[PDB]
Amino acid sequence: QLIEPYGGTLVNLIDPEKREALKHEALSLPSLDLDWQQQCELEMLMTGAYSPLTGFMTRAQCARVESAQQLDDGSFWPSPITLTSRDRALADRRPGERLALRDGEGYMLAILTLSDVWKDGERWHLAGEVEGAALPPHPDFVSLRATPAELRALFVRRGWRRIIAWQARQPMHRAQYEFCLKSAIENEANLLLHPQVGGDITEAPAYFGLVRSFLAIRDRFPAATTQLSLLPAPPPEASGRALLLRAIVARNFGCSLLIAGRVDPSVAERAEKIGVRLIAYPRMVYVEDRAEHLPEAEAPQGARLLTLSGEEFQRRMRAGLKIPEWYSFPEVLAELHRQTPPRERQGFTVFFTGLSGAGKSTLARALAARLMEMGGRCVTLLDGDIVRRHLSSELGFSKAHRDVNVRRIGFVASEITKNRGIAICAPIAPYRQTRRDVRAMIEAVGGFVEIHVATDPYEVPETPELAIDTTGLAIDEAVQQILLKLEHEGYLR
Amino acid sequence: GFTVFFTGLSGAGKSTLARALAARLMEMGGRCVTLLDGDIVRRHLSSELGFSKAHRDVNVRRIGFVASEITKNRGIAICAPIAPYRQTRRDVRAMIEAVGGFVEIHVATDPYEVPETPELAIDTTGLAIDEAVQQILLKLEHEGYLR
């Protein structure tokens, strides 16, 4: 039947009436604003994902795990659950004190009753029983988010008992999909698609795409046998320990099986221990002779086997190359392309750099006109009137004033490109430093092409995409020379 | 593209509403969402602005500019700056309305000035965030912007 909670009973650090009294008391307390990953940890703990745990571990507890892997009971526990921050307002806090914990906006979540307090590297650690008022606000995917208690209830209405969990950290294609199925049939189990979702709406907004790529292919799964739900946490870093923790939260969510993809006999040992069987994910190959993926070692002798690395998938996707019909599904493919388009189709800024002895501006305007012939992507010239008028009309010529200007313009450019537009910029920028940051800011969200026009101080661009090394180039010839770069870099459609 | 422009007094949860609304809109994909509010806007756009009359005017407009670029390019921009002058709100709306969709939401739960013509005016007394967020998804739905 239904595996039950680790420790034996499901923790819930949120008692309502106490809820009210609690916000009230937080009014009068010191407060910590958590970063997004700690709120995850908090939510996991507050919510029973870590039953029997009921507070953040204490440096001494923190230590007995990495050794004997036990709690104070001697009960088994793979890995340190701890709450951290880098606020200087923590140095002068001490045990016995009660701390208000709040999301990044001052929204109140729980009060921590301090067991222990110390620092490590650049981050402070905290310990003590927790009393919860509210969970981190989650406007998004309300349906898809269940607490271990909510999920267990669901399973029970669905009449489910035995359940394999797949705690995805990245999108699923046909090999994982086909392996989940047979795994499931093999262990006579229902299937839980449990993608790790932890992030923030502005430092970590990548989970949205992940959730959407699961929504995309969910209908390919048997409805009476499959569930989708979100697991609020960051993916951990692979390690036998991490693995054993995930097994524990899998158990706390109701799952008695876990797919991981390894399996050092030592860890499957301790895991079969704590009631959750973890099956390993093999090298799947597409076996043409059979029209289906099999674990590589189950494939017939001398069949023609077929594979596609992630390096190579990702490559084809950037380049608009063909993906084999057997690798994914059209929907997922279509979705991955809405998230990360082919160069031929994504945004980019063209960043002109050189001295005021250039015709930087002249080149930039001409290049804008040409690029406008294309349509599909909108072109914005961040140069003359525009930039004074809106962005830097109250900036001096101070060192850091022009630095701020360059960066301001590099910001607006990144928004243009993130959104699939092309931004063309030719500000005054003499510091390898500051150009260094602009490129990274935009390169994160799309394409960056530096063009060095070489026909207080300054500093050489040491690594442009294009360096106009001419002596009598006319505008036409130079513009063409850069359309040639964009063409050869892949950005033109 | 469209920007969602929250206006009201610092007695609002403007910012709180804006963040929640961003999260919801991110469920959709197809268009990218950018929250022009806290750290972001100081950090990049107005970190050398006073509180002078025309200094905050410049700030409001600066933010209305970046928003217009987001929307022109098919993105959704969500903004909740301090803006008390019908004047300046007047220009922001036109700047973005030229290039895409503008939806003002008046959160009514020196001087100021009434928004006389929002798309949505949250006229409640005990609205909770969820209820208010929904109330605005209802506006976007009925205005046509949701896919």
Next chain:
Amino acid sequence: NQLIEPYGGTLVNLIDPEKREALKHEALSLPSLDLDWQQQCELEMLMTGAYSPLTGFMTRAQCARVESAQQLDDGSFWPSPITLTSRDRALADRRPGERLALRDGEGYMLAILTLSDVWKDGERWHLAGEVEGAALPPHPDFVSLRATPAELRALFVRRGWRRIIAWQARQPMHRAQYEFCLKSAIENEANLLLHPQVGGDITEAPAYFGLVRSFLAIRDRFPAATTQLSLLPAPPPEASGRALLLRAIVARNFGCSLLIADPSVAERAEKIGVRLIAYPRMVYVEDRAEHLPEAEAPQGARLLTLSGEEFQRRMRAGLKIPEWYSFPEVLAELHRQTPPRERQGFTVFFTGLSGAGKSTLARALAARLMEMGGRCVTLLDGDIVRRHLSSELGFSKAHRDVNVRRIGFVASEITKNRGIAICAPIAPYRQTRRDVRAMIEAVGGFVEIHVATDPYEVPETPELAIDTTGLAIDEAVQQILLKLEHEGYLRLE
């Protein structure tokens, strides 16, 4: 606004799990009523709060007082008598005070009724009294989609919804209703609840399955953040104003403050707090590529409509359905439910005297029909029917008249399932042949062929009557392929 509160002011719940074991025990020792499927609906509605403030079945006086002043004992408003029936003789000797076990059709226990009043009207017995519930009618099907008023309200609250139009469908939705819901929702700044009436039995009235499936089919055409699908366990009522006022009340108890369906009822309705908007003649306005209420259409625009009479007809004939009318999915689904004659099942029922020619015709007709594939043909005649259907049957008045129905039954199953059944039993009674025809005509096509070439009874209304006496098998066979070809049942590549 906000979430309209239950009628009467607080949401009834006749099921206290605290008293659940005690009730299942007490019942054993009680007299018991097995409810028909529609009463279980009434019970479930009552047991569940759809009729708050009601908390038991009304009493002959209360029933009479509703039909008059439309009030409860409080004088509060109430449109229509809620009452429990049964057509069980074992009810004649039962009396107020007694406690009755209420159970589904398979003796599964639901609640105990504490008798207030017991009386009779025509064919049926009426019952009254407070109700104490143990279990709800078992519903294996559509578990997800079935919410109690409390469950639904809770859902609405997570979704952050407040103001809600409900549409309590009793039949599939096409583009006109869909487009009109959409605008009623934008116009009233409301969320939309698709709430199809779903009461039936797995056999008694398994028509709701199709209804639900046709909603699932088109649900994706609806804005996700603005629409909800849920089932409303009840039979559709018969159109009245009290009735319409009841639906408004259950709409209120489920959370809805608007109901699509007057107008002096829109009078009393607006009164209990639920605004009911009426459904107008929708027309497709070509000039605007959209449906509008007829009175909002521009003048002299070409208006387009399609009656249900005509829709039905086109569907039964394979004719083209406009594209503004429905959606491909729904069309596709309505065709999986009820196929064109071309593709539907039918039995060919030969009748006449002995009637060895009957058998000979039947076999030839089978051979021909078998050339066609798509539908499987079964010859219910000689060895077959002996062996398995009638190996043991006298020649009684009632043993030949059971043999016939026996064969109508197997035939009906063949045709229900899209096959063609060919039968030629001995049957001299109109009435028995009528019952067979009705049984199979319910589930598919019936074609009687009277071979005219105790005391027989010439069919008075066959589809085909082979008279002429110098007929070869071939000619006769052809003559019936003609009947079928002309009746629509034949098709080919």
